[PDB]
Amino acid sequence: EEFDAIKIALASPDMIRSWSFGEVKKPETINYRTFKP
């Protein structure tokens, strides 16, 4: 937890992949009856 200072920089593409967990591909949220992802 314990940290010292803050930094800003630009989000490189490889950074955004590095953080991300999986490529979204759809607008779909859920099913109409089975209210589930």
Binding site: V24, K25, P27, F35
Partner: protein, 50 residues
């Protein structure tokens, strides 16, 4: 989320994400097809717009 009476409620961002993904996917489609550059342009103005 839902409410008591079956109603749902959402944040406005999801609309925006949906528009984005619809537009990107349609663009990919139009790129598989060698379709005219004019509709490419229009789809991209729509993209940068959203």
């Amino acid at each position: 989320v839902p409410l008591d009476g079956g109603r749902f409620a959402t944040s406005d961002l999801n609309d925006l994400y949906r528009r984005v993904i619809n537009r990107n996917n349609r663009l990919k489609r139009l790129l598989d097809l060698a379709a005219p550059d004019i509709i490419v342009r229009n789809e991209k103005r729509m993209l940068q717009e959203a």
